[PDB]
Paper text:
The Aurora kinases A, B and C are serine/threonine kinases involved in the regulation of the cell division process. Aurora A is involved in the transition from the G2 to the M phase of the cell cycle by promoting centrosome maturation and mitotic spindle development. Dysfunction or overexpression of Aurora kinases has been observed in various human tumors, such as breast, lung, ovarian, prostate and colon cancer. The resulting 7-(2-anilinopyrimidin-4-yl)-1-benzazepin-2-ones were synthesized and proved to be dual inhibitors of Aurora A kinase and [name] receptor kinases.
To confirm the binding mode of the members of the new Aurora A inhibitor class, we determined the crystal structures of the kinase in complex with the representative inhibitors 2a and 2c. The two cocrystallized inhibitors shared similar binding modes, which were in agreement with the ones suggested by the docking analyses employing the constraint between the aniline NH and Ala213 of the protein. While the anilinopyrimidine elements of the inhibitors adopted flat configurations in the ATP adenine binding pocket, the benzazepine-2-one partial structures filled the hydrophobic region. Towards the hinge area, the pyrimidine ring formed a weak hydrogen bond from C(6)H to Glu211. Another hydrogen bond was detected between the carbonyl group of Ala213 and the NH group of the aniline element. The third contact was established between the pyrimidine nitrogen atom 1 and the NH group of Ala213. In the structure with 2c, an additional interaction between the methoxy group of the ligand and Arg137 was observed. The main result drawn from the docking studies and the crystal structure analyses was the finding that the 3- and 4-positions of the aniline ring are oriented towards the entrance of the ATP binding pocket. Therefore, these positions were assumed as suitable attachment points for further substituents that would not interfere unfavorably with binding.
Author numbering: 125 to 275, 292 to 390
Write the structure that this text describes.
């Protein structure tokens, strides 16, 4: 736990430009170690009321070490800005891949779902649940392995939007949503408005294009149950026949 400063880094290529600061390639001067630097504006964290949410996320994310979870090495701030020192994921976001390829084959999807489930299983056994398990938040390492990055309805389970009580089962719903989006190229409750999406999620109205195979339909259908208790354990996901037939990672 060495306290860092901007002068300890050479900043490079913008990796992502969003409304919330930006993420840059950076290199640590002394070590030459390449990483990614997320630049947040402190006045936009006060006035979005999330400074607590940041502090707690940073604390949790610094302790977590899994091959499919993007490492947070540390953080610092100056007058204006807060800096997150992150693992650099050379092959970029799953979002971008999905934009490129429009949709993923069964093998790539099943592999991604394995990697997710593994990283989630590990998460859960440290009492960490998640909300934004979505393509913008999944990155790809040098080996093309999935890495969960973490910090609009489309990925949220019924219990959450309805305002009901929720458990670790939210993340199972997310896998189903993502599994669907990976194969189809759009998430299963997508709409043109929030209000309608809300209805689609709440009534669990999804359908499958012809090309989605029977095994995939079965797994997605099992993951997208209204009743949390009826969604499978992560172990059952990893041991689904469609997953084991198609995945590449064990
Ligand atoms: C376009 O090619 C890339 C792009 C990113 C990378 N590596 C990388 N490594 C750590 C963080 C990030 C990161 C973090 C948050 C983020 C983004 C990116 C931008 C789009 C998604 C989004 O909404 N926000 N990217 C490598 C090649």
């Amino acid at each position: 736990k060495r306290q860092w400063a901007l002068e300890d880094f050479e900043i490079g290529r913008p990796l992502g430009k969003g409304k919330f600061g930006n993420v840059y390639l950076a290199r640590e001067k002394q070590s030459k170690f390449i990483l990614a630097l997320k630049v947040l504006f402190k006045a936009q964290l006060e006035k979005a009321g999330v400074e607590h949410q940041l502090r707690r996320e940073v604390e949790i994310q610094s302790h977590l070490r899994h091959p499919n979870i993007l490492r947070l090495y540390g953080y610092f701030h100056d007058a204006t800005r807060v800096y997150l020192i992150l693992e650099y994921a050379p092959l970029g976001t799953v979002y971008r891949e999905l934009q490129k390829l429009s949709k993923f084959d069964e093998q790539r999807t099943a592999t991604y779902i394995t990697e997710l489930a593994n990283a989630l299983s590990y998460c859960h056994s440290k009492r960490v649940i998640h909300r934004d398990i979505k393509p913008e938040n999944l990155l790809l390492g040098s080996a093309g392995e999935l890495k969960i990055a973490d910090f609009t309805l489309d990925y949220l389970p019924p219990e959450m939007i309805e305002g009901r009580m929720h458990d670790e089962k939210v993340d199972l719903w997310s896998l189903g949503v993502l599994c669907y989006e990976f194969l189809v190229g759009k998430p299963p409750f997508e709409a043109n408005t929030y209000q309608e999406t809300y209805k689609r999620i709440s009534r669990v109205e999804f359908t499958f294009p012809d090309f989605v195979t029977e095994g995939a339909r079965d797994l997605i259908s099992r993951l997208l149950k209204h009743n949390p208790s009826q969604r499978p354990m992560l172990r059952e996901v990893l041991e689904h026949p469609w997953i084991t037939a198609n995945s590449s990672k064990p």
